[PDB]
Design a protein around this ligand. Structure first.
Ligand SMILES: NC[C@H]1CC[C@@H](C(=O)O)CC1
Length: 251
């Protein structure tokens, strides 16, 4: 492994986002449904958002897939996993509109007792170095099985991706935007003409940026008001500010 090597946007294959994890819940009735996204950060660890699991925190109930480009069908080279350990951030909160410390860790273990193995469809995403983010106005990529329009009932069957641009705290903390709801441990991103964005079901997925030739996990899909609404960008967990929390649990 060599690390880092939807409204609008386009369809894609997992070769373009080989770090993408598709997380599913098995329920209480035997039926399995899509919960949300995630990113492979090391062979045994997938990173996502706490809000994806806060209502069902029993590890035994989740299924993780790597190398999956299709929602309810099989893709050649996909690897299935059990969640060995589900770590939610104890300081998670969502009392108001914003979700605070919205980050989660999933230890993955296949029925064959193995962790993720590199292939053309399974790869790791580079974690940022402490506090090192791309410049405001940088184009980064988002990926998911989320809705194509907020009013849609169904989820697309094929994986999607688009490009969004990082927005400064100054701009995002404006009152017609999110105001004081966005903290410094969050990152805002949007399409300049509000035509593309992450939507419902893209939660936990990554905001992938290129820094020093490395695709970096700069954000994790967290929250926002609607999808692709003027002045209402997608808000992301600012990974570069959660490194001791990640390290503390992957040691
Ligand atoms: N645009 C980002 C935002 C992330 C998920 C959210 C939700 O699941 O409610 C809707 C949109």
């Amino acid at each position: 492994f060599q690390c880092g090597q939807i409204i609008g946007g386009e369809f894609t294959t997992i070769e373009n986002q080989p770090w993408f994890a598709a997380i599913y819940r098995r329920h209480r009735g035997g039926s399995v449904t899509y919960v949300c996204g995630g990113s492979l950060i090391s062979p045994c660890w997938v990173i996502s958002a706490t809000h994806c699991f806060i209502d069902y925190p029993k590890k035994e109930d989740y299924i993780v897939y790597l190398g999956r480009s299709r929602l309810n069908s099989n893709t050649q080279g996909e690897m299935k996993f059990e969640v060995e350990n589900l770590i939610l951030h104890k300081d998670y909160s969502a009392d108001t509109l914003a979700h605070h410390n919205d980050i989660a860790l999933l230890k993955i273990r296949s029925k064959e007792g193995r962790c993720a193995q590199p292939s053309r469809t399974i790869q790791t995403i580079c974690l940022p170095s402490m506090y090192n983010d791309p410049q405001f106005g940088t184009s980064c990529e988002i990926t998911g099985f989320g809705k194509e329009n907020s009013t849609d009932y169904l989820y697309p069957e094929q994986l999607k991706m688009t490009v969004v641009k990082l927005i400064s705290h100054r701009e995002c903390q404006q009152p017609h935007y999110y105001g004081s709801e966005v903290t410094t441990k969050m990152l805002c991103a949007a399409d300049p003409q509000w035509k593309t964005d992450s939507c419902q079901g893209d939660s936990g997925g990554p905001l992938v940026c290129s820094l020093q030739g490395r695709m970096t996990l700069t954000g994790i899909v967290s929250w926002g008001r609607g999808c692709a609404l003027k002045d209402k960008p997608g808000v992301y967990t600012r990974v570069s500010h959660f490194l001791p929390w990640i390290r503390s649990h992957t040691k």
